[PDB]
Amino acid sequence: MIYSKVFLKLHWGFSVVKPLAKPGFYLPPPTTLIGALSYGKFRGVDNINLGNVYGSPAYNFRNIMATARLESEGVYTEDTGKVYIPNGRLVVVYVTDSISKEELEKLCWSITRIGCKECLASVENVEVGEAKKVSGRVKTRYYFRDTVKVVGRKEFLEYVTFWEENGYIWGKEGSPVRYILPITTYPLASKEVEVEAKEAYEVGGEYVVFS
RNA sequence: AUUGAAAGUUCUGUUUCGAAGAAAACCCGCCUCAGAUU
């Protein structure tokens, strides 16, 4: 199981509108991160024949694990929800085993935006390595699933609804999955939360929790 | 190529016309550059 870290500098912020008044999300979903990763290889094509229906040029990277977190302060504003965090930093962690280190690093250096067109984002540095799996009590900053238990004080937890990869095909709605975010609503920032969990990869001290 | 792909809240308008900081008032009343030298 290999892992990679990437540091992104944002220009003005990101904007992803909730499916189904147009409120937005607080942090990008894993689908957006996987698509941003896949952009490095599938650049220039917008419709590929999956075999039965044209749904997206991204239904092939669906088995890559990804998380992300903030490192600065920003504000969520509706005026079409947006998250303004100019000149901020975003740290993204990719954990997978499908491709070798070289391919993942090459695709990691090839990220241009997160969400819509305006949300450009530069790349400052990357790291590649091998991760280890543990199950003891850990402290994390990246968001995780709803089913994961919690030992600390419930003070900085929020609930959001994300979708699986099934939504990659047009004319179809993805399955709803609950997620827990360790975020302060105003102003936006990230806080550490201690969890027990069952699977957690050590990617440099900042343990990442998946289940 | 990411609930992503496609979208100008844009066009038109004077803060304008008029109204003396003006009239009265001494700086002024006394004081040696003076005694000695071819």
Short description:
This protein is mainly beta.
Give an overview in words.
It is classed as rna binding protein/rna/dna. Keywords: Cascade CRISPR CRISPR-Cas Cas Cas5 Cas7 crRNA TypeI-A, DNA-RNA hybrid, RNA BINDING PROTEIN-RNA-DNA complex. The protein is mainly beta. 8% of the residues lie in helices and 36% in strands. It has helices at residues 30-38, 101-108, and strands at 2-10, 13-14, 65-70, 75-78, 81-84, 89-96, 121-130, 132-134, 138-140, 144-145, 158-163, 176-181, 183-184, 189-190, 193-195, 200-202, 208-209. The strands form 6 sheets. It has a 4-stranded antiparallel sheet with strand order 3-6-1-7, covered by helices on one side. It is globular. It starts with a strand and ends with a strand. It binds one RNA strand of 38 nucleotides through residues 16-20, 28-29, 31-39, 42-46, 56-58, 112-117, 163, 167-168, 170, 173-174.
List the defining traits of the structure above:
1 chains, 211 residues, mainly beta, four-stranded antiparallel β-sheet, globular, RNA-binding
Helix and strand layout, with pairings?
Elements (H helix, E strand, L loop, with lengths): L1 E9 L2 E2 L15 H9 L26 E6 L4 E4 L2 E4 L4 E8 L4 H8 L12 E10 L1 E3 L3 E3 L3 E2 L12 E6 L12 E6 L1 E2 L4 E2 L2 E3 L4 E3 L5 E2 L2
Antiparallel strand pairs: 1-6, 1-7, 2-5, 3-6, 4-5, 8-16, 9-15, 10-12, 11-12, 13-14, 16-17
The structure holds one RNA strand of 38 nucleotides.
Largest sheet: 4 strands, antiparallel
Distance between the termini: 16 Å
Q: How would you write the strand order of the largest sheet?
A: 3-6-1-7
Structural class: mainly beta
Number of strands: 17
**Compute the gyration radius: what is it?**
17 Å
- Helices, by number, come to 2
Beta-strand fraction estimate? 35-45%
**Helical percent range?**
under 10%
Protein name: CRISPR system aCascade subunit Cas5 1
Keywords: Antiviral defense, RNA-binding
GO biological process, one term: defense response to virus
GO molecular function: RNA binding
